[PDB]
Structure formats: C-alpha cells, structure tokens
Amino acid sequence: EIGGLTKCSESAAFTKRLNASVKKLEQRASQYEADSPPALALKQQVERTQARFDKYSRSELLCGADGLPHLVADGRWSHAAEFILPGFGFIYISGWIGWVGRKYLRAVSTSANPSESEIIINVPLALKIMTTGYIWPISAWQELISNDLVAVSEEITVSPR
C-alpha cells in the first residue's frame, strides 16, 4: 500500500508474532496447575495479548516486513487516527494548560504579594481559572485582537547589541 507496506490483517509476520507471544505465555502457564493464581494471571495476559493483536488487525494500521505496525503521518485522513486526531487532542489539552497558567500568572501579577502567590497557590482563583480552559482558542483570538496577547518591544528589556 503506502510506502510498499501491507495491512497488519494481511501480514503473515504479524500473525506469526501473535502466535509466538501467545505460545510463550501458554508455555509459562503450563508449568502451574489450572486453578493456580499464576495460571489465571497468565491466561488473562493471553486474552489481553489476543485482544490487542485483534484490535490492531481490525484497524487501518499498516505493517512492515517485520510484522510490526507502522504509522502514516503525512497528513492523510485515512490514517488520521494515528497522528492527526491524537495531535488535535494534545494541542487542545496543552493549550488549555498553558492558557490557564498564563492567565493565573497575569491575574496574581497585581495581587498584594505576587511572588507569594507563585509559591503558595491561591487555590480558589486557580480552580476558577482552570475551569475556563475549554475555550482557550477563542480567548486567545480575542486577546490577540484586543492587543492583550502580544507586548511591544519598547516595553521589553534587551541587552546591548
């Protein structure tokens, strides 16, 4: 397919890996009695291994010659579940964290003792501000348009050139 790869549900090496992993787990399980907690734990590991291999098989994941899933991250939507959608989630979460941190720092910058509020967090203000993170991109846009996001150079210290 892409890059001369093949679907893991069509890869002989992938299925060989599944069989090998299950066989080693069951060989370990064969040393105990059927009702021993080691045996039950090993058989649950076997089930989880089989479920994982099956989940990768039913997915769109592609596989190289080694029989391991490879990720496609050139921007195609047909593989968006591998980089694009997780990337969307990460950007959303990280922007939330950063926006609420910046907002809290700017809010306590005008308190009686700004430095004290950085080592001893005002928890009520922090929780209130953290709950506002979900609209961080809209807030960021409004801050950018209203000239509150970006400062002027004349107001920022620099060293002699």
Binding site: Y32, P38, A41, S115, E116, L149, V150, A151, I156, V158
Partner: protein
C-alpha cells in the same frame, strides 16, 4: 552531678510556620525574589547552626530530628515485614530453600509490566528480592506469615512511638544543653544498656527460640509441625529433648559449671554443612560474650557515684615530647561541636559498614545466604557503598568543624594546632605517596596490556611470568588456616573457609572455599590502596586547608561552601572545602567501583559455582581471573563485555526492568556531565532569551528565573553522576547475579 534538666512547653504546636516557607532563615523569611530562593530553602533546611546561634536549640532540634529518622526506619522495617507477610513466597521457600527463589515484591498488571512477576516458584509470581529477608527470618525462627504480620504491626507501633517522642521532646519537654553535655553518662548507658542489654536479650532470643527452631528445621522437620515459640519457653522438656543441658536448668549458670552449657554455646567455627551459614550456637555464645564485654565497658566513666573515669582527665594526660600539649582541648571540642562528633561518627559507621560487607561475605551468618549469590553480591555491594558515603561525610563534617567551630584560643599547641602547623609536610608527602602508588599499581596493568599487545606474554607481570606474589597475605592465610588446633585450640574449625580448608557445598552450589591470592590479587590490592590514598589526599587537604592557604589566606571568612574567590591569582575555582568534598566523592566512587568489581569477578571466577558429588568444581567464569584481570583489556572484555550479556539480553523476560534501569542510569550519568562540564554564565544568558520570549507574550514570573548557583551546579552534576554510575552497576550486578544464582 548528672541530672535531668528539661524545659516544658518549649515550642508551640501550630501550622503557621508550615505556611511560611523559609521561616527558619532570616534572609529566606522575606520570601522569594528569584528561583534561587527556592533552592536555598532546601539547602539550608537542616543546617541548624546557621538558623540560630544557641547550642541548646541546635541540640534540641537534633534530638527530635533523630526521633523522626527512627520513626522512618521503623516504618521501613514494618513495611518489609508486611510485604513478607502478604506479598511473598516465604512459606513455600521455608519448605525448599534451595529451589525456590525468594520474592517479596509483586507488581500490578498494567501496561504490560506484569512480566516483572517472575516464575520464582512456590505457586507465586513476583520480583526476586536480594536483601536477605528470608534468610534473616529463618535464622530468627520465623516459620509463619502471621509472625511476620505481628512483627510488622509492632514496627508500625514503634514508628508512631518514635514520632510522638520527637514531637514531645521538641515541643513539650526539651532538654537543656547541660543535659546533652553528659558524654560520660551517655557512654555508660549506650555501652551497658543499648549494646550490652541488646546483646544479652538477643542472645536470650537465640538460645530460647531461634536455636531449637533452626535445629528442627535443619533436621528436616516441616515448618507446620515445629512447636510454637512459646512452647519452648513453657516446656523445659521440649528443650531437653534437643539440648540435654537444659534438663539441668540454670543451676550450672549460678554454680559456675558453665561447661555444662557446651551443647548450645559452642566454638565450632566453620559453617553449618546443611545451611551453609554460621552455627547458631556459635552466634549465641558470641552475643552472650559481647553482652558481657559491653556491660563491663559501660562502667568505665564517672557519673554520680565517685568511681569511674573522667574523659577530659584521660585525654589531658596523654601528651608526649613530640606533641606539645597533646590531647588537651579535645574534650571541649567533642562536647561543644556537633560537627566534630558527626565527623568521627560518620567515619566510624562507614568503616564499620565496609567491615560488615567483608565479614558477611566471608563468614555468611544466615542460613542459605552463601549459595544465594544474588543476595551475597547485593549485600556486599550495598554495604560498601554505604560505608564509602559515610566516610566521605565524616570528612565533610570535619571540614565544617574547622570552618565554624574551631577556635584558635582553645587549641594552642595541642594536636590539632600542630597538625595545622605542618599541613604542608603532610599534604606534600601524601601527594608523593599517591603518585608512587598510582604510577606503580596502574603501570603494572599498562605494562601488561602493552606486553600482551606486542606478543610478549613472557615479559608480563603474571603468575606465568614475572611474578608479584602477595607473600604477606599468603603468610597470614596460612596462619589463619593453622589456627583452629594451635593458637585457637578450642576452635574446631577455621573462622572462615576463605583462608583455606574444604569446599562447603549446599544444594550442589559452593558456599565458601579457599580464596587463593596471586599476582592479580597483588595488583588489585595495590589499586585499592592507591584509590583510598587519593581519596584521603583530597579530603585531608579539604580539612587542613579549610581555614586558610597560601592562595587564599582568609578562607574561613568565606565559609565552608563557596564557589571560588574569583579569577584572580590565576583562578581560585573550587578552593573551598565543600569543593574538596565534591572531588573526594568522585574519587570514593572510583574506589568503591573498583572494590565491588574485584569482589564480583574474583568470587565468580574462583569461589562460586557448581560442584559434582564426585568433587569436580566448575566455577561461574571458569577461573579466568588470574590471567584476564592483569590487563585492562581483560577487564573490558572478560568482565564488563562478557558479564553485561545478561543485562543487555534481558528484554522480554522478568529481568527486563534491569535492562531498562541499565539504560536509564547510563542516561542520567551522561546527563550529569552537562552540569559538571559547563558554567552558569552560559545558562543565565540563555535564560535571558527565554524570559524574553515569555515577556513578548505579556507574562513572566515575579520569581525571576535564575541559572543554578555555581555550587548547586556542582552538586547537581555530582548527584546525577553518582546516581547514574551506581545505578548502572546496580542493574548490571542484579541481572548477572539473578542469572547465576
């Protein structure tokens, strides 16, 4: 007059100061203006003498903090007992100590980490643990997990008691300084009470509980059939069945016919053939004799009854024609400086840990310890590291004494004064000794590598060539081998088989056999002498040049810990005694690393291994130490490269955590070099550009970011260096030893 003086309600109990970080320091109390404040807060937290100028307050803080440490230690011991009681295969291991692998840690099934639950035997999966808990518990007479649960419960109770005692003796009943300055009474109590009564009571446990239980367990009795421990107390007939002299009772003890107790108080020496450990009857006799010795020692000093010695008098009398006033002033130093006492006590405790490591390998005290090669390696290595750190700390606190608590007026023409007066001679001669040792000891190896590379094996320093036999060590070994019949006539066997004798075999594995010393042992022992001498050079230079030097005449005014005195005079970086501790730590790491590598390779090559019933010995690494350890190439190939196989091939097995930790320790060790090789000017300049980017978006902390201080840069670099190197050796040793055990 030895009296108890206590002030009541000394300090209020309140959470106010918990909300005022840095309250203990006048400067740090004003609050942070830069991130440096934060680091300073942790650095000065337990520096009590800088938080107050009253010695009584420092003593009170130290006493309560000691209680806190005791509470933590009890919590740790209680946790180990609880994990033995609920997450171990101790019961199964009791039935077959030889084939079942000891395990007292279990991991939860998450993200695949359950692979770490090894197939250790006994219908149990977990991590193979190497701290020796099962052997110790079996030696104590513990046969059930319920006994372990009760020991853990008591550990929790004692931890709470220590915590309350610390709170009580800081906040409710704080002793006066006059109470603390009771060296005579403290020595009397700690010798006679703590050490003497401790030994006597432990001997009581061993005689009454541990001895009969182990005699039964060795005889092949099942743990589920052995009588409960209190039955041995309430049934003198039960003991009379095992040790017949108990049928006479205590009549011989008070009659003086102590020979009657020869059946349970012995002097056998050697090892128990079934267990591979010391005879428990020898250990009981040992603890009883020690208890007597300590109780005697605890009546030497005068407290309240006229009789006894005054330490100051004894010290003052010991002076000669070479030493001026001699030991005068030492008593005042050791009763007014906590740093002087800590220097002595850290030096002693570290040296004792090293001694413990040696003695515990050569005379394995617990049953089935000797053939648990993983446990033996881990215990030796752990106690070596602890000892190295403690000796270096003793040096550091000696330097702190010199800077802060040394007064010229109280040390005129005494031993300390005269040492300071010939520091140049001392340091120059130690420097020369270090060069001589290093050149010769390491040049042996370099010469050998060059000769072997040039195809000239007959020109090497080796057994098969120019020989360097450790004849003095061999002479001592022969003397100790001949001791049992002649110079220790009542000993039935040698103190340790390492000196000579038969091979002690347990479950087909070698517990101990004679450790022969040749040219390779000569070379490695002189390497040890070299590394120790260099470490002493660095630390003694730090102590003797702590106050002053020809370079910086007023060092004491700069303090114990300062980065430098500027780039002048050619450059004065790392002239402080703290920097001498910093460099000595690297050298101690080098020394201990070599010592533990010597142990690992020598034991694998010449001691540990299998032994057929016929008598054929197969050592773990096939006796390659003698011809491979005499070159650096042999260490790189036959020790590191070869024995790293287990740690690097561990992926996909229960040992994979060791491969991961091996890699992570390499990573942290390399990460430390960024701090050690660089300087804070660069980092502060980079932080300026980063602060610019934050300011360009209208936000920046009022706690201004700062690169670490010079001294903190050094401290961080060294801490990560030690963590990385030691953790690498840790993973490597543990994977190797779990494979070979």
């Amino acid at each position: 007059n030895v009296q108890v003086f206590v002030e009541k309600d000394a300090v209020e109990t309140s959470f106010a100061k918990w909300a005022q970080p840095g309250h203990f320091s006048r400067t740090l109390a004003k609050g942070p203006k830069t991130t440096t404040w934060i680091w300073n807060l942790h650095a000065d937290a337990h520096d009590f003498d800088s938080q107050t100028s009253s010695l009584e307050e420092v003593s009170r803080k130290i006493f309560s903090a000691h209680f806190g440490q005791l509470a933590i230690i009890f919590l740790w011991i209680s946790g180990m007992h609880f994990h033995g009681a609920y997450f171990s295969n101790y019961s199964a291991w009791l039935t077959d100590p030889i084939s079942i692998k000891q395990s007292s840690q279990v991991v939860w099934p998450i993200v695949g980490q359950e692979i770490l639950n090894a197939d250790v035997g006994g219908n149990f999966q977990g991590i193979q643990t190497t701290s020796g808990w099962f052997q110790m518990w079996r030696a104590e007479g513990i046969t059930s997990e319920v006994e372990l649960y009760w020991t853990a419960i008591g550990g929790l109770a004692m931890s709470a008691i220590m915590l309350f005692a610390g709170w009580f003796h800081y906040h409710k009943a704080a002793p006066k300084l006059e109470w603390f300055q009771n060296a005579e009474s403290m020595m009397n109590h700690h010798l006679a009470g703590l050490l003497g009564l401790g030994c006597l009571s432990w001997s009581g446990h061993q005689i009454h509980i541990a001895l009969p239980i182990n005699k039964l367990l060795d005889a092949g009795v099942s743990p589920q059939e052995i009588p409960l421990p209190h039955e041995f107390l309430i049934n003198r007939d039960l003991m009379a069945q095992l040790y017949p002299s108990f049928s006479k009772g205590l009549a011989p003890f008070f009659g003086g016919n102590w020979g009657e107790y020869s059946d349970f108080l012995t002097f056998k020496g050697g090892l128990n053939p079934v267990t591979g450990g010391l005879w428990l009857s020898d250990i009981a006799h040992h603890h009883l004799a020690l208890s007597v010795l300590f109780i005697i020692a605890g009546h030497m000093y005068r407290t309240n009854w006229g009789i006894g010695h005054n330490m100051k008098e004894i010290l003052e009398a010991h002076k000669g024609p070479f030493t001026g006033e001699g030991h005068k002033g030492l008593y005042e130093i050791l009763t007014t400086s906590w740093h002087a006492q800590l220097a002595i006590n850290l030096a002693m405790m570290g040296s004792l840990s090293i001694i413990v490591a040696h003695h515990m390998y050569a005379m394995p005290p617990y049953p089935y310890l000797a053939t648990d090669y993983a446990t033996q390696l881990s215990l030796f290595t752990h106690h070596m590291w602890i000892g190295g750190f403690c000796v270096v700390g003793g040096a550091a606190h000696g330097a702190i004494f010199m800077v802060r608590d040394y007064t010229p007026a109280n040390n005129y023409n005494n031993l300390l004064d005269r040492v300071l007066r010939h520091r140049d001679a001392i340091i120059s001669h130690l420097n020369w000794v270090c060069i001589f040792l290093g050149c010769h000891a390491f040049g042996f190896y370099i010469h050998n590598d060059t000769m072997r590379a040039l195809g000239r094996p007959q020109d090497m320093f080796s057994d098969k060539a120019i020989q360097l036999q450790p004849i003095f060590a061999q002479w001592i070994q022969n003397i100790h081998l001949l001791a049992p019949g002649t110079t220790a006539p009542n000993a039935l066997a040698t103190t340790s088989y390492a000196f000579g004798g038969d091979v002690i075999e347990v479950g087909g594995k070698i517990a101990m056999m004679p450790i022969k010393l040749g040219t390779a042992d000569f070379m490695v022992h002189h390497i040890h002498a070299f590394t120790i001498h260099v470490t002493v050079l660095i630390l003694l230079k730090g102590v003797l040049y702590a106050r002053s030097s020809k370079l910086i005449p007023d060092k004491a005014n700069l303090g114990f810990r300062f980065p430098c005195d500027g780039p002048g005079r050619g450059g004065t970086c790392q002239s402080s005694s703290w920097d001498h501790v910093f460099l000595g730590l690297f050298w101690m790491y080098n020394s201990i690393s070599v010592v533990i590598f010597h142990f690992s390779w020598k034991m694998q090559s010449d001691v540990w291994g299998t032994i057929t019933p016929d008598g054929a010995i197969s050592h773990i690494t096939g006796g390659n130490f003698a011809q491979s350890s005499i070159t650096i190439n042999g260490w790189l190939r036959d020790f590191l490269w070869s024995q790293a196989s287990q740690v690097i091939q561990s992926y996909g097995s229960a040992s994979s955590a060791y491969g991961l930790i091996f890699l992570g320790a390499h990573f942290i060790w390399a990460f430390s070099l960024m701090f050690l090789f660089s300087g804070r000017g660069y980092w502060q300049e980079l932080i300026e550009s980063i602060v610019w980017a934050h300011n360009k978006l209208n936000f920046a902390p009022t706690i201004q970011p700062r690169a670490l201080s010079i001294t903190q840069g050094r401290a961080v670099g060294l801490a990560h260096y030690l963590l990385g190197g030691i953790g690498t050796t840790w993973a490597f040793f543990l994977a190797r030893a779990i494979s070979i055990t």
